Amino acid sequence: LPLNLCFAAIREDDLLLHQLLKRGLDPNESDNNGRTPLHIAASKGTLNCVLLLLEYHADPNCRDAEGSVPLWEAMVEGHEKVVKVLLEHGSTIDAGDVGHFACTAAEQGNLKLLKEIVLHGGDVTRPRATGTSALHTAVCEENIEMVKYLLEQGADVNKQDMHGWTPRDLAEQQGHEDIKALFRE
Ligand SMILES: [Mg+2]
Ligand SMILES: [Mg+2]
């Protein structure tokens, strides 16, 4: 176990983190997956760690390997105070892979998270690079309300994933009349 900023952030040890920051450790140094201590602090919701990292010039819009950003790490775990502080420092949701974020929210049946992406200016109709969209996923999960919202947000019903399926195509195969009925209008 190396003694680095991630070590402290993972353990929510803001005193240790502070001491390491004063010793000159670089908060913009990331692990093998592009994870920074600010990713981790934002995920754990440790406000003191977040503030100290930002003070020592952690990039508020840092992207890891999955395209995740500190703002999203905080949003997924419901750390509203950290979200506010990150926004104040210039974090934007569209700095990350919003398509991926959107699909993840759909996969977790989390409609409030989908709306928060939109609140912060994210286009939740964007697909993953694989072509899957939150609408695709919403159909599979047969999440009626989430399908509405996504449709109301302008979600492409004829968007083909990499396996040729559109959200509409999927609706017919699951025989969810309620959902197919919504595709007609
Ligand atoms: Mg503490
Ligand atoms: Mg400085």
Distance CA 80, CA 171 (A): 35
Residue-number span of the structural domain to which 20 is assigned = 1-185
Tokens of 1: 């176990």
Q: For position 32, which CATH number holds? A: 1.25.40.20
Distance from Cα 51 to the centre of ligand 1, integer Å: 12
Distance CA 57, CA 88 (A): 14
- Say how many CA atoms lie within 13 Å of 4 toward its Cβ: 14
- C-alpha distances in Å from residue 149, one per residue of 106, 120, 124, 154: 11, 16, 10, 9
Domain count for the chain: 1
Determined by X-ray
**Size of the chain, expressed as the number of residues it contains:** 185
Distance from Cα 12 to the centre of ligand 1, integer Å: 6
Note the ligand closest to the C-alpha atom of 11: 1
Distance from Cα 76 to the centre of ligand 2, integer Å: 29
Q: Which of 148, 139, 73, 154 is nearest to 106 (CA)?
A: 139
Q: Which of 167, 8, 36, 79 is nearest to 87 (CA)?
A: 79
Distance CA 48, CA 165 (A): 46
- Say how many CA atoms lie within 13 Å of 176 toward its Cβ: 18
Answer yes or no: are the C-beta atoms of 149 and 115 closer than 8 Å: yes
Q: Measured in Å, how far apart are the chain's first and last C-alpha atoms?
A: 57
Answer yes or no: are the C-beta atoms of 144 and 178 closer than 8 Å: yes
Q: What SS3 state is found at 122?
A: coil
Distance from Cα 18 to the centre of ligand 2, integer Å: 13
Note the ligand closest to the C-alpha atom of 48: 1
Q: Which of 43, 48, 47 is nearest to 15 (CA)?
A: 48
Tokens of 113: 């998270």
Note the ligand closest to the C-alpha atom of 16: 1
Distance from Cα 22 to the centre of ligand 2, integer Å: 10
Distance from Cα 147 to the centre of ligand 2, integer Å: 46
Q: Which of 151, 99, 147 is nearest to 123 (CA)?
A: 99
Distance from Cα 56 to the centre of ligand 2, integer Å: 5
Handedness of CA 148, 136, 110, 83 (dihedral sign): negative
Distance CA 124, CA 163 (A): 21
Per the rule left: phi > 0, alpha: psi between -120 and 50, beta: everything else, 79 is beta
Resolution value (Å, 1 decimal) = 1.9
Distance from Cα 24 to the centre of ligand 1, integer Å: 20
* Per-residue buried b or exposed e for 111-135, using 16+ beta carbons within 10 Å of the residue's own CB: bebbebbbebebebbbbbeebbbbb
